[PDB]
Design a protein around this ligand. Structure first.
Ligand SMILES: [Mg+2]
Ligand SMILES: [Mg+2]
Ligand SMILES: [Mg+2]
Ligand SMILES: [Mg+2]
Ligand SMILES: [Mg+2]
Ligand SMILES: [Mg+2]
Ligand SMILES: [Mg+2]
Ligand SMILES: [Mg+2]
Ligand SMILES: [Mg+2]
Ligand SMILES: [Mg+2]
Ligand SMILES: [Mg+2]
Ligand SMILES: [Mg+2]
Ligand SMILES: [Mg+2]
Ligand SMILES: [Mg+2]
Ligand SMILES: [Mg+2]
Ligand SMILES: [Mg+2]
Ligand SMILES: [Mg+2]
Ligand SMILES: [Mg+2]
Ligand SMILES: [Mg+2]
Ligand SMILES: [Mg+2]
Ligand SMILES: [Mg+2]
Ligand SMILES: [Mg+2]
Ligand SMILES: [Mg+2]
Ligand SMILES: [Mg+2]
Ligand SMILES: [Mg+2]
Ligand SMILES: [Mg+2]
Ligand SMILES: [Mg+2]
Ligand SMILES: [Mg+2]
Ligand SMILES: [Mg+2]
Ligand SMILES: [Mg+2]
Ligand SMILES: [Mg+2]
Ligand SMILES: [Mg+2]
Ligand SMILES: [Mg+2]
Ligand SMILES: [Mg+2]
Ligand SMILES: [Mg+2]
Ligand SMILES: [Mg+2]
Ligand SMILES: [Mg+2]
Ligand SMILES: [Mg+2]
Ligand SMILES: [Mg+2]
Ligand SMILES: [Mg+2]
Ligand SMILES: [Mg+2]
Ligand SMILES: [Mg+2]
Ligand SMILES: [Mg+2]
Ligand SMILES: [Mg+2]
Ligand SMILES: [Mg+2]
Ligand SMILES: [Mg+2]
Ligand SMILES: [Mg+2]
Ligand SMILES: [Mg+2]
Ligand SMILES: [Mg+2]
Ligand SMILES: [Mg+2]
Ligand SMILES: [Mg+2]
Ligand SMILES: [Zn+2]
Lengths: 75, 104, 159
RNA sequence: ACCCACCCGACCCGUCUUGAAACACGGACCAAGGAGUCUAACACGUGCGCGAGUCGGGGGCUCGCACGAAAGCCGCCGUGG
RNA sequence: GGCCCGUCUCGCCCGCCGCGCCGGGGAGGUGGAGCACGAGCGCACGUGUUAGGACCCGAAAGAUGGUGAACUAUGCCUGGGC
RNA sequence: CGAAAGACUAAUCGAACCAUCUAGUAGCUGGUUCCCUCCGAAGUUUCCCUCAGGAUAGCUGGCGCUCUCGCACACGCAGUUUUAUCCGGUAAAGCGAAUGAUUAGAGGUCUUGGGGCCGAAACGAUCUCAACCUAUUCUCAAACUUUAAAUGGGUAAGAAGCCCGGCUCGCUGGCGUGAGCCGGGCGUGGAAUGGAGUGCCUAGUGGGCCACUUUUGGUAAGCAGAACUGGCGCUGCGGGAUGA
RNA sequence: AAGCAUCGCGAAGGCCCGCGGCGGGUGUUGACGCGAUGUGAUUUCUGCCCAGUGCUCUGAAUGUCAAAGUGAAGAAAUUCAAUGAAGCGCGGGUAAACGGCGGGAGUAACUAUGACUCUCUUAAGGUAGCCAAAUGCCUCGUCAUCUAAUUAGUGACGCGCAU
RNA sequence: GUGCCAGGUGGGGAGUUUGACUGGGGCGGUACACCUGUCAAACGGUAACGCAGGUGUCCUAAGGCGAGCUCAGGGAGGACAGAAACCUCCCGUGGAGCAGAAGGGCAAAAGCUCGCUUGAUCUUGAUUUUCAGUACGAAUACAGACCGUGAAAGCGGGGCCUCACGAUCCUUCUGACCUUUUGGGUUUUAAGCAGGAGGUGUCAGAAAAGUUACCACAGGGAUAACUGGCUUGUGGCGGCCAAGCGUUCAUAGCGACGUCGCUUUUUGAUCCUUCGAUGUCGGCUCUUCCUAUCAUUGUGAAGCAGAAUUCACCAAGCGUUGGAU
RNA sequence: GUCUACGGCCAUACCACCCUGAACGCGCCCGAUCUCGUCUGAUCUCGGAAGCUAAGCAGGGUCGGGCCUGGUUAGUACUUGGAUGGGAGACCGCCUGGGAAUACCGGGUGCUGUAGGCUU
RNA sequence: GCUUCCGUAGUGCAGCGGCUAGCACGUUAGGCUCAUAAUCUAAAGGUCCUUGGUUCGAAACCAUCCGGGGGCACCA
RNA sequence: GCCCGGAUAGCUCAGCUGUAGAGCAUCAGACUUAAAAUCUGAGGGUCCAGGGUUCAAGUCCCUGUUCGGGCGCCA
RNA sequence: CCAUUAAUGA
C-alpha cells in the first residue's frame, strides 16, 4: 500500500492566491537585538536629554531671532 | 579520556579562579523515603501486579561522565558538577602521553 | 530524502574563486558600516566563524546592529508564503557594500542640484527618468556607393 | 395540460474513488416510519438591560393555585459567582 | 520612555520598644497570562470543540446471575432381545 | 464427559442456551430527507507505534473594523517590464589548463630491468615493452573544471528623503567619533495597471491523476518517483467518429 | 486393546476435587493394591552418550538468601553489622526422561577406501538392522524383471538433502 | 494442624502484547535520528528500498595563546647504504597534513616542533539552522565578571566549518546564614527554586514472544494469488551485411563478429478492473478461427542422374492416429 | 626622475636568462664583550664600518613562458515562450527574443597613498 | 539469478610479497644385500587458467574474462 | 548495580612472602642385536597489565580486560 | 609387578 511521498505542485498557486506580501515595514523599528551596552547608554542619553532644556529652548529662541534678522535683511 | 585531579577554574562562592580537586561522580542510594519512592512503594503494595513501567530498551553504550569539582582552599569547600561528553574510557592522572617518544 | 545540514551543497557557494585563495586583504576587514546601510551578502570560504546560511548568499538587507567585529542585518527571506524581515548576525568578511543605492543617491543629488538651478529662472525641466524612446527619425546617408548585396551561402558538409 | 408523429440530442440513480453507464456495490413496485437531537463546560460573533459594577442562586413574604406549579416584592438587593 | 512582582550584578544610605543573621530604599540586565483614569456582569441566538447512547444501523468479544444429560458422552440400578 | 474426532453436551460447541451490563467499542462499510442566490477548495509542510487516522500550517467561508473617494485637487500594493547593483557553476565548451580515464606516431644513453641478436662482457651498433622526459595528436566525466550563458533570485527607483543650527551620553575617545532628542527650509521621484491595510471565529482537505519542457530507476510500460506551469478531480460547450 | 517396561505411595501417605470445615473420590481400598506414563500381539534385539533441559540424593565442607528475631549509634524515626530456612549455585545418580549420534589429520606392495592411532565443539559420534520405503531435492538414481511400450509394481546397491 | 505475614516454584490457571516503511506480506535492508558529494534542471526548496559512503566514537591534548620552520614529491651528491635507513644543496601553490566519511578552507597557517596554560569556568537575554517559524541538538555575534597566553595589538567561553545525540514523571549530586514542613519554638527528616547526570536508537520518547490448515469479525481490488490491459528483458520467429563451412565457389543449403524487427502460444515487470466472490489445474466431449505448412493440389531452386530428401511461393480446403507410464 | 619605511589593489606585479646602477639609500660585509638562543654568532639577537655593487633590490631587454584585455571561433553551441511543423522514433527545421567557451591572431608587462631623503 | 570456493609437473596438494616454487604418489638411475621386498636420498620434472594494473620486485594485493564444484528461491 | 571466584611454558594442571613443580609435544642422549615401549637432559614461563604496606608479592589489596554463577528492578 | 615383533629364497 504505497503512496505519494512529496510534491510542490499546487503549492505555488495556493501561495499566490492570497497575495504573498512584503513584511510590515514600519517607521521607528524596534531595538530587539541591538548590543546591550549601546542600548544601556542610549537609555542613559534618553534619560539625561531632559537636562539642558533651558539651554535648548534659549538657543532655539536665539535661532528664531537669527532667522528673523535674516528675513529682515532679505526683505 | 584523560583529566587531571587538579583544575584551576571558577568557583561560585569565591568568585575567582581557584584550584579545585577533581574526582569522578557516582550515584547514591535511593534512601527509600523520598516522595516518589514512597508513592511507588504504596502503589506497588497490594495486588495489581506492577503499576509503573520497567524500561528494557537500552541503546547507549556509555554515559556522560561527571566531574565533582571540590575546592581546595578552606572556609569555602564548594562543590560543583561538570559534565563532559560521552566516552567509554576514562581515567585521572592517566599517563600524559609523552610527546616525542617511540611507539612500539 | 536529503540531509538537513547547514552546509549541504556549498561546494561552489562557500568557496574561493580561481587564483584568489590565501590571505584575505585588509581593506575588506576595515570597511565601515553604519545603521541602515544597504548591504549585500556573499559568503567566503576562508573565514568560517560568523558565516551566514546558504539561503542568504546573494541576498541584500539593511543593517540594524553593528557589533565589534560583526554586523547585524535585517534581510528578507521568503518562507514559502510570506517574506519575513529577519535579523542575522554576519561577520565582516562575508559582507560587501551594495551599490544599488549609490546610483539612486547620485540621482537624488543631481535632481537637487537641477532643482536649485532654474528655480529663479522660471523654466520647468523634466527630472524624472524615461525609458528607451523611439529612435528619432533621421537620414541614412551614403557617399555615392550602393549597399553590398548579401547572398545566402551554398551548403557544404563540414565533417 | 392527455395521446400520437417527425428532427436532433440523450447509457441507471446513490456511493467508494484519480477515474462509473459499467462485466464495482445497494436497488421488483407502492404506502407509512426513518437518521445531526437534549444537558453541562467553554470559545468567538450578534441582540437586550444595567454599568465598576452586574446577577438574584437558594430562601422568604403576597392568593384561596381556573388561567399558576405563572407573576410581583425583599434593612436576605448581595451570603456568594 | 516610566511603574509592579520574581530572579541576577554593583555599591551606598536611613529608622527603632526590643540596635539584631532587623526592616526599607538606589542604579542596571532579564522573565510575567501585568499597570499605564476601567468594561464587565446577567439573559437570549448562531457556529465550532468536547464529555455523555452523541447523526443513524452494524461486530469478533468480556463480565454477572440463572436453565437444560427428552438428543448425545460416560458410570450405576432394574428389565427386554439376539 | 470423551476406546480421543476438539467429538458430544436438546438441528447451537476450539467453550451451550436465556436475561442484564448494553443503545459495549470501532481510525472500519452503508445511508443521511425542501428550494433559490452568492463565494468556493485539497490530496501539500512538520509531528505522532503515524501509513485507511489525527494535530498543526496552507487552501476556504462568514462577521466586521480602519482609511481614500469623478463633488475641480491620491499615500500605498504587484507570479509585470525597465534602469543600475550583486549571487550562480546548469546547458555549452575544455582537458595543447589542474584531478581521474584513455589512442597512436616523432625526437631524446634522465634511468634501470625481462624475452632477446652480434659479443666472455661493454651506456659498443639494432629495436622492444614496464615505469621516463619533451612538444604533438584521438575520445571523454552526475559525484572533474580555467571559462561560461538563456531562463532566474534579492535590492533601490524618495517626505519613513535630503540640507542646516543646537542639547544629551555613564559607549569610544589626542582633539574626536557614533547614537538619541529638539527647531527650521525644500514635494509631482521610471512604464502601465490597481481602491488598500487589518482582527476574529472557521468547515472541508491531508489516497490524487494527466500533459509541453527538464529529469531519476528500469529493456520498456496506460510502470514507479521528482521540478515549473496548465488542466481533470470540481467543468458543462464546438471539434478529435467514440472518449478525463 | 492384551503383552512389555517405568515412576510415586505403608494411611498425619500417593493422585485428585472443594469458597469453606474432624470436608470428599480412589476407599465396602492396602504393594498380586491405587494413581501417573510410554510402547503396542508371537519371535529376536533394544547399541553409545548425563554436555544441555528435566527429575532425584546429602551437605554446617558452603557463594547468594526475605520476614521475624540479635547487637551498635542517635533524642527518635532511621541506619549499620553479624546470624542468615527452603530454593537457586557446587558435587553424584538418572536416557523403556525429553533428546542427540558430526567434522579434521596420518596410515595397507596398482589406484581408491581405511582394520589402527590422536584431537575439536559438547558428552559418544548411527551399533545391530533397514531403505530410493508412507521416509531421497537431485531423480523418471543404477541394474535385473514384469511390457510391444511402464515417471507405475517387485527384487537388489548405498553415496541415506533428512532411516 | 489452623489463623496471619515473608521467600522459592508456578502457563495448572487469568489478563495483555507480539513496532513501522515496504513496487502484496514474511524473509533480506533502514531509505526510522543524523552528516558529505550527486540526483537537482547556475537563489533557496525538491522524491524513490536512486548511487558512493560515513556516525552513536576520540582527544589533558588532537582544546587556548605566542614563537621558529615548511609539507608530499623530484633531481644532484655522500663509507657500509642498494629503489626505501641518515647528512647537505636546489626546484617545490600546496600536488602533504589538519582523528575519522566526503566537500570546502588553510603556507612565516588552521600543518610539525616547542614554552605556558585550562575560555572545555559562572550568569541574563537576542539570533540562525529542520521548522509550524514549536522544541531538542548544533552554531552565531554580543553583555557582566573572573582568567589563560603574548611585548602588545588581540585571540579563546572546546575541537578549521558542515553530525558525534535525547521531553514529562521518578531518582541522585551540588548551591544559597533561600522558602515551607498548616497552633507556636528547636533539631533530624521531607517537600520546594536552579544547574548537571541516570533514557527513551521505533532516536518529539508504550513496559511486550509465538502459532492457528479449528479459527472469527469490520473492511480493501488503497493490496497479491487467476484471467483480461501496457511492455517484450526472457521464450519463440523473420530479415540486413558477409570473415568463413561447402573437393574449387560467401549466399544450393548454412553462416561467426555486429545489427534491425514481429508475437502474446512461455516466464518475467506493473497494479489498471474485480475481495457485499468472475468456481482455482488437468483429462473426456464438442464447435469455430489463425498460419509461423507436417502431408495432400499447383509450382520455382538444389552440391535434383533415378529413388529418397532439403530451400521457397500461392494456399488453412481436407486430414494430423491406437497405446504402456 | 628615483629610493627608504609602512602600505591599498594583489602576476599588466610572477618565473627563466642577459645588460645597466651617479648620489641618498637598502643590503652584502667585520666580530661575539654586553642582551639573546643554537651542535655550530649558519638563523636570531647585540656591538660596528675596512671593502662592495659580486648578490638581493631598482630599471630595461627576450619574434620568452605565464598573466590582463580585445578580434576570430560565431550569431556557432546552448537557451525563455509558441505551433493540429516534419519524422515510426531518435532528433531536426521555423517564429520569437537573448547568446557562450577552445584552438587561432593582435596590444600591454604595474598604477597609487602617507612621511622622509638624493639628483643641493 | 545471489552469496561464494579452487584453478600451481601425469596426480593429491602446499607455499608471511624478497626460496633453487617444500614434498609425496609414478617414470629413470645409483648405493646396499648372497641376491630380492621396503628404504635414503638424486636427476629431464611445471602455459602459477588468461588479460590488465600498483609496487623496486607478484602465485600471494586489486578489476574483468574463462573452466570444476557447494547452498538459498516462502503464502495464496 | 551488589556479592563470590578464575586468568600461568606452544597446550593441560598444582603451588600461603625468605631460581614457580608435573604431564602432552619438539630436539638429543640412554636400555635392547634392532624397532616399539621405558628412563634422563635442553629449550619454552609478559603468572592479563599497572599501582600500593613491605627489604623482596603472581600469592595481601585496589584500578582497567574477559570467562562465570546468585540476587534485585521506576525514569 | 610389565616384556610386543623380527620380510621372501639359500
Ligand atoms: Mg499521502
Ligand atoms: Mg502483598
Ligand atoms: Mg475508503
Ligand atoms: Mg474525490
Ligand atoms: Mg480503484
Ligand atoms: Mg455512477
Ligand atoms: Mg467493464
Ligand atoms: Mg463495498
Ligand atoms: Mg440485488
Ligand atoms: Mg414518509
Ligand atoms: Mg473553538
Ligand atoms: Mg457576547
Ligand atoms: Mg469560581
Ligand atoms: Mg448509535
Ligand atoms: Mg454530539
Ligand atoms: Mg451493538
Ligand atoms: Mg478482555
Ligand atoms: Mg486437530
Ligand atoms: Mg454559482
Ligand atoms: Mg486507519
Ligand atoms: Mg550543483
Ligand atoms: Mg555537459
Ligand atoms: Mg483518506
Ligand atoms: Mg500508482
Ligand atoms: Mg517410555
Ligand atoms: Mg534406547
Ligand atoms: Mg543430566
Ligand atoms: Mg549401518
Ligand atoms: Mg499399470
Ligand atoms: Mg523397491
Ligand atoms: Mg495464558
Ligand atoms: Mg487477547
Ligand atoms: Mg506492514
Ligand atoms: Mg533552480
Ligand atoms: Mg603561528
Ligand atoms: Mg566575555
Ligand atoms: Mg586546532
Ligand atoms: Mg493439522
Ligand atoms: Mg499453510
Ligand atoms: Mg488495483
Ligand atoms: Mg495474468
Ligand atoms: Mg528475444
Ligand atoms: Mg572459402
Ligand atoms: Mg456468482
Ligand atoms: Mg460464471
Ligand atoms: Mg504463407
Ligand atoms: Mg488412454
Ligand atoms: Mg655573522
Ligand atoms: Mg647587488
Ligand atoms: Mg649587477
Ligand atoms: Mg608572451
Ligand atoms: Zn572557593
Amino acid at each position: 500500500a504505497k503512496s505519494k511521498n512529496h510534491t510542490t505542485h499546487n503549492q505555488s498557486r495556493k501561495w499566490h492566491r492570497n497575495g504573498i506580501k512584503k513584511p510590515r515595514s514600519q517607521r521607528y523599528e524596534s531595538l530587539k537585538g541591538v548590543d546591550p551596552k549601546f542600548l544601556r547608554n542610549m537609555r542613559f542619553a534618553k534619560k539625561h536629554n531632559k537636562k539642558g532644556l533651558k539651554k535648548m529652548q534659549a538657543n532655539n529662541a536665539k535661532a528664531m531671532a537669527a532667522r528673523a534678522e535674516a528675513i529682515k535683511a532679505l526683505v | 579520556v584523560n583529566v587531571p585531579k587538579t583544575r584551576r577554574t571558577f568557583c561560585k562562592k569565591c568568585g575567582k579562579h581557584q584550584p579545585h580537586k577533581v574526582t569522578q561522580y557516582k550515584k547514591g542510594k535511593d534512601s527509600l523515603y523520598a516522595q516518589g519512592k514512597r508513592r511507588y512503594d504504596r502503589k506497588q503494595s497490594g495486588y495489581g501486579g506492577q503499576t509503573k513501567p520497567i524500561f528494557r530498551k537500552k541503546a547507549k553504550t556509555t554515559k556522560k561522565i561527571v566531574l565533582r569539582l571540590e575546592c581546595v582552599e578552606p572556609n569555602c569547600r564548594s562543590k560543583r558538577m561538570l559534565a563532559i561528553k560521552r566516552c567509554k574510557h576514562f581515567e585521572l592522572g592517566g599517563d600524559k602521553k609523552r610527546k616525542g617518544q617511540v611507539i612500539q | 530524502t536529503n540531509t538537513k545540514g547547514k552546509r549541504r551543497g556549498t561546494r561552489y557557494m562557500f568557496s574561493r574563486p580561481f587564483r584568489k585563495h590565501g590571505v584575505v586583504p585588509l581593506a575588506t576587514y576595515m570597511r565601515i558600516y553604519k545603521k541602515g546601510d544597504i548591504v549585500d551578502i556573499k559568503g567566503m570560504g576562508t573565514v568560517q566563524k560568523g558565516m551566514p546560511h546558504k539561503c542568504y548568499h546573494g541576498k541584500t538587507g539593511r543593517v540594524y546592529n553593528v557589533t565589534q567585529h560583526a554586523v547585524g542585518i535585517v534581510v528578507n527571506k521568503q518562507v514559502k508564503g510570506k517574506i519575513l524581515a529577519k535579523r542575522i548576525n554576519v561577520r565582516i568578511e562575508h559582507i560587501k557594500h551594495s551599490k544599488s543605492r549609490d546610483s539612486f543617491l547620485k540621482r537624488v543629488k543631481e535632481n537637487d542640484q537641477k532643482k536649485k538651478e532654474a528655480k529663479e529662472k522660471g523654466t520647468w525641466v523634466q527630472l524624472k527618468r524615461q525609458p528607451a524612446p523611439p529612435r528619432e527619425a533621421h537620414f541614412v546617408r551614403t557617399n555615392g556607393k550602393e549597399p553590398e548585396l548579401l547572398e545566402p551561402i551554398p551548403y557544404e558538409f563540414m565533417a
